[PDB]
């Protein structure tokens, strides 16, 4: 899997975001993870820790897996990291998201997401509170 350049345009919520790809303007929904409606509990918070990651960045990627790019909706799926981290990654280490959607050929980083789950979970975390 490869790294490639993008820059945020707007955040939207826990596991979406506005970003321009190839210069292009496109929502992107996170690769496995699925993180609480905004009128969810931890809804806000999972918004919020997404947003900060994202906007506080130099540097926004995304990464493509080997499956589908974009789903039925247009939403480009990707693994999406910022200044190196992965955005999916953090969501779950911290609870505000849990593994989630894991299609076959578009599961390359299903084994580490599970591992943060297994931590977040095993300290209580937010959602696993
Ligand atoms: C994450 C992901 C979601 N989807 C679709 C499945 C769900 O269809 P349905 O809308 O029919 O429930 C929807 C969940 O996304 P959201 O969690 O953003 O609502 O997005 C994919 O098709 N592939 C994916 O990798
Ligand atoms: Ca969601």
Known sequence: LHKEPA??????????????????????????????????????????????MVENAKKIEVEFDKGQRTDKYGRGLAYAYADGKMVNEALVRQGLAKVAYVYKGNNTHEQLLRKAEAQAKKEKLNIWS
């Open 7 to 52: 820059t945020l345009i707007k955040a939207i919520d826990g596991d979406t975001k506005k970003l321009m790809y190839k210069g292009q303007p496109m929502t992107f929904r996170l690769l496995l993870v699925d993180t609480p409606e905004f009128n969810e509990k931890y809804g806000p918070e999972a918004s919020a820790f997404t947003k900060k």
